C-alpha cells in the first residue's frame, strides 16, 4: 500500500524546535514528519489580524519562495504550533522502514489535465513542459478565464496541452467539488482519519 497523495486529518504529537518540525499522528505505523515551512499559516496560533497581515503578501514562483522565507525568518515553530493541534496533511514521501512519512499541509489534487492547489496562492498556470508557444499562449488564456480563487492555484499538466477548450474547465470544476468534499469530510471526522485517498 503506497500512501503518497493521501490526505489525513491528523494531530501534532510533538513540536521539535531543533529541527523546526512537528511530528504527526495520522494513522500510519510511525509519526509523519512536518517541516515548519510546509505548514500553511492558517494553522499558526496567532491573532486573526496577524494572519491577515501575512496572507496578503505583507518564474513568479519566486514571489511564493520569498513569501515562505518571510515566515521562516519571522516565527519559530514552537511560537505558533502546539502539541495536539489538528491539521490536514498530505503524504509527500512514503514511510521507508523505520523512517516515517514526509508530509505537507500545502495540498494538491490532481485531475486529468491539471493539478488543483486549494492551499497555495499561486493563481494557476502551466506545466514546465510549457514549450510549444501555440499551446502556452492559448492555455495561459484558458487558465486566465478560470477565475481561480483567492489563495488557490491550478497547474495545467502536459495531458492538457493538446486539450479541449472546455475539457479543462470541466476537470477544474471537478477538482473544486472534490476540494469541497474533502473539507466537508473533515468536519465529520476525528483525529487520525483518512480523508482522501489518492485514487490512481
Author numbering: 36 to 93, 129 to 270
Q: Which text from the study accompanies this structure?
A:
One of the key enzymes of RNA processing and decay in numerous bacterial species is the endoribonuclease RNase E. In addition to its well characterized hydrolytic nuclease activity, RNase E also acts as a molecular hub that co-ordinates the formation of a multi-enzyme assembly termed the RNA degradosome. The protomer of EcNTD can be divided into large and small domains, which are connected by a pair of conserved CPxCxGxG motifs that co-ordinate a zinc ion. Within the large domain, four sub-domains can be further assigned based on function and similarity to homologous structural folds, namely RNase H, DNase I, S1 and 5′-sensor. However, the only significant deviation from conservation of this domain is a highly diverse insertion within the S1 domain in members of the α-proteobacteria and plants.
Furthermore, we have determined the crystal structure of a fragment of the C. crescentus RNase E catalytic domain encompassing the helicase-binding region, and show that a significant portion of the S1 insertion adopts an α-helical structure despite being predicted to be natively unstructured. The CcNTD1–575 construct was crystallized and x-ray diffraction data were collected to 2.1 Å resolution. The crystal unit cell was too small to accommodate a complete CcNTD1–575 protomer, suggesting that the protein had been proteolytically degraded prior to crystallization, leaving only a fragment of the full length CcNTD1–575 in the crystal. The final model encompasses residues 35–270 of CcNTD, which corresponds to the proteolytic fragment capable of interacting with RhlB that we had observed in the previous sections (CcNTD1–274). Residues 95–124 in this region could not be modelled, most likely due to conformational flexibility in agreement with predictions by PONDR and ANCHOR. Curiously, RhlB co-purified with the CcNTD1–274 fragment, indicating that the S1 and 5′-sensor domains of RNase E harbours the RhlB interaction site. The portions of the S1 insert that could be modelled are on the surface of the tetramer and are solvent exposed. Nonetheless, it is noteworthy that a helix from the S1 insert protrudes directly into the predicted RNA binding site of tetrameric CcNTD. From the crystal structure of CcNTD1–274 presented here it appears that the partially helical S1 insert occupies the area where RNA is bound in the E. coli RNase E structure. Negatively charged side-chains (specifically Asp 129, Glu 131 and Glu 132) could potentially mimic the negatively charged RNA substrate.
